[PDB]
């Protein structure tokens, strides 16, 4: 018994605040640079761990989850499964970061199969766009093995469309076409006026327009005759079930329309026959308005661009193009850090290779007689306190097929190649490297 007195103000200010802010920074509000919520980041990190051995192998979605627990995801594996199932689709993602094998859901029915059937792997889009994985920032807590955020070439957050919800805050970003985002990023790189990205929903054949900052998503319908119509498209928010049970069951029950189903390969294709109980005024504008209103082919959504900046704090943007003019700037510094790290690594590798070649030449020339001496003193001997004394243990561990002349010149060739690579890395700029990495995205 350790009875202590606690006040409600201290409980709310400490424990309730800790959860409420944790929900903001972890449960939702995807990172601006990453484009991932933490659960999706863990899922993709585990998928990369699995694909390390072979990137073309499909792994069970149950295998992608479950193992996320050791990486630092202490929030139950069902959420990880569900978040990994929402990333491997193509109807939901305009730029998927996981490839799938099985019934991952379609636009008609927006639910994936159970985790026991469908397989997932890291798609070619992730390898094409996401670079500098090894140079990603390290998370503050040691149990968070995945980095703070990956480093995509383009802001994947405005690519697939996020909808996060938190205590006090929420986010909603509409999908944008990959080509337009790439063009905007390139313009921001070169430092000119940047065109706003164009909203494009995946597997959607319709019209999306800008009206006073809103975004009206419209389907398409045509009249095959006086009384027959063909719903060629429906707004993106609708499934086959929540569209039928919301617009066509009430209309059929009221005895206004008689609808057939044609939701084939061409998305949704409902065919509607009108009765005399439905108004069919010959006015074109009025008829179009009535059809769009009763059939729910018009859906209005407004972006709530709330993200997490590079400093791990909530930030709210207003313009659609305001992540780009900041993501590009931070990614430039990160590419500069990559360049410096590569320069240091290449210099170290070239020095090691040159020292290796020099030691090989000295040992094949009889300067260092290996026979007739103990390993410890030989390490303490002329192999130490000399130009290659820093890599004495590495040289000592050399294998056999290097005294031979077959590889004696090969080591010198590799040292020269490393020096050339270091010279290349020194003779480069961050703008050129970033604009070269952008050409990979076709």
């Amino acid at each position: 018994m350790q009875l202590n007195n606690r006040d409600l103000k201290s409980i709310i200010d400490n424990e309730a605040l800790a959860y409420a802010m944790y929900t903001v920074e972890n449960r939702a509000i995807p990172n601006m640079i990453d484009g991932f919520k933490p659960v999706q980041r863990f899922v993709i990190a585990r998928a990369l761990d699995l694909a390390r051995g072979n990137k073309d192998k499909f792994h069970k979605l149950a295998s992608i989850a479950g193992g996320v627990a050791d990486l630092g995801y202490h929030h139950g594996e069902n959420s990880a499964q569900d978040a990994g199932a929402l990333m491997a689709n193509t109807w939901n993602n305009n730029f998927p970061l996981l490839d799938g094998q099985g019934n991952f859901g379609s636009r008609t029915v927006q639910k994936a199969a159970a985790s026991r059937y469908i397989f997932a792997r890291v798609s070619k889009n992730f390898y094409n766009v996401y670079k500098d994985t090894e140079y990603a920032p390290v998370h503050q807590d040691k149990e968070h093995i995945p980095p703070a955020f990956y480093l995509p070439i383009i802001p994947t957050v405005l690519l697939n469309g996020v909808s996060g919800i938190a205590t006090g805050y929420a986010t909603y970003i509409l999908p944008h076409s990959v080509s337009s985002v790439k063009k905007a990023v390139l313009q921001a790189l070169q430092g000119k006026k940047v065109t706003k990205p164009k909203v494009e929903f995946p597997e959607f054949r319709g019209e999306v327009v800008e009206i006073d900052g809103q975004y009206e998503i419209r389907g398409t319908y045509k009249f095959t005759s006086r009384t027959q119509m063909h719903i060629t498209e429906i707004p993106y928010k609708y499934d086959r079930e929540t569209y039928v049970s919301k617009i066509l069951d009430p209309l059929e029950n009221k005895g206004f329309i008689t609808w057939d189903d044609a939701c084939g390969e061409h998305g949704f294709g409902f065919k509607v026959k009108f009765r005399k109980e439905y108004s069919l005024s010959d006015n074109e504008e009025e008829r179009h308005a009535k059809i769009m209103k009763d059939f729910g082919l018009i859906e209005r959504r407004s972006q709530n661009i709330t993200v997490i900046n590079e400093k791990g704090k909530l930030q709210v943007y207003d313009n659609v193009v305001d992540l780009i003019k900041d993501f590009v700037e931070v990614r430039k510094t990160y590419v500069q850090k990559r360049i410096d790290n590569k320069i240091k690594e290449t210099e170290s590798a070239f020095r090691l290779a040159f020292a290796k070649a020099h030691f090989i030449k000295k040992v094949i020339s009889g300067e260092i007689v290996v026979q007739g001496k103990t390993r410890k003193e030989l390490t303490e001997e002329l192999s130490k306190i000399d130009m290659y004394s820093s890599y004495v243990d590495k040289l000592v561990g050399m294998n056999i097929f290097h005294m031979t002349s077959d590889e004696a010149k090969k080591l010198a060739e590799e040292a020269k190649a490393k020096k050339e690579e270091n010279e290349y890395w020194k003779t480069t700029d961050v703008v050129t490297e970033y604009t070269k990495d952008l050409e990979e995205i076709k």
Binding site: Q101, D260, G264
Partner: protein
């Protein structure tokens, strides 16, 4: 008007409609996009089907899946599923070099399509009128491509294609359990209306060619004959790509189930409450 029913546009109409009985919601999502949109249905069951053998209809229509199968297809327990036309003049013709004896109100299965006797008569095909007393009924009932035309039906649908997974459970505890449940209407089996969609259990591709093995036993008989391959054992119907699903739906390999003369004892052996029959049957 059940919840998870993918209604065909000619359900309650006289047409060659089909109802697909997958055993889960994960097996149905890709079916929506690949139906005929006119003659194709769909209803997900829930795992292992209740052992329908031996219970009264009152307890039979208590499980949700059996009740929904009854509601969808229109089959009601204890009453038949369709009446046949009255027997009339018998006609014999030679189809593909084989003598076939039919009535004036029969259906002929030609190239996967059922054609009426009147249509064949209108197609300038020779018909031989034969007295009813001089007609071999045993040979008439042995022809799988000949079936009598129905006067009237209530089965909303015209075909019930049991399309379950090809795992051992799917083919052993669920397929010949829906078979036992549908055995309450033997007319469905007599008319060739209960079919099983052959879903591959193993899609082993070699080079750039994909091979489909519909049973594990089929795979083990060809494991050492095929070249090097990567076996893709699909656990359930929801693990098939959209391309393979559409190919196997639009180019189906059905298995029309017909019952032998001793089907009752065969079903009692596998479903009845007597483990000795199963013990004797398994050790052979």
């Amino acid at each position: 008007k059940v919840h998870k029913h993918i209604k065909a546009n000619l359900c309650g109409k006289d047409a060659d409609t089909t109802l697909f009985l997958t055993e889960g919601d994960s097996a149905i999502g890709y079916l929506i996009d690949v139906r005929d949109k006119e003659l194709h249905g769909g209803y997900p069951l829930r795992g292992k089907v209740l052992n329908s053998w031996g219970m009264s209809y009152a307890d039979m229509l208590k499980n949700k899946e059996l009740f929904d199968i009854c509601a969808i297809t229109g089959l009601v327990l204890g009453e038949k599923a369709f009446e046949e036309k009255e027997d009339g003049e018998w006609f014999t013709f030679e189809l593909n070099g084989d003598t076939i004896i039919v009535n004036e109100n029969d259906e002929v299965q030609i190239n996967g399509k059922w054609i009426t006797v009147g249509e064949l008569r209108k197609n300038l095909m020779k018909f031989v009128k034969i007295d009813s007393s001089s007609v071999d009924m045993k040979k008439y009932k042995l022809q799988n491509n000949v079936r009598r035309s129905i006067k009237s039906s209530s089965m909303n649908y015209a075909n019930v294609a049991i399309m379950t997974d090809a795992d051992h459970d799917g083919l052993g505890s669920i397929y010949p359990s829906l078979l036992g449940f549908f055995s309450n209407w033997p007319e469905l089996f007599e008319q060739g209306r209960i079919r099983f969609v052959k879903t591959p259990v193993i899609i082993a591709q070699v080079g750039k060619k994909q091979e489909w093995f519909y049973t594990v036993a089929e795979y083990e008989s060809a494991k050492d004959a095929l070249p090097k391959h990567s076996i893709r054992y699909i656990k359930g119907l929801g693990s098939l790509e959209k391309s393979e699903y559409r190919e196997m739906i639009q180019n189906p390999v059905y298995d029309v189930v017909k019952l032998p003369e001793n089907w009752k004892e065969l079903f009692e052996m596998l479903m009845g409450d007597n483990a000795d029959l199963r013990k004797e049957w398994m050790s052979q």
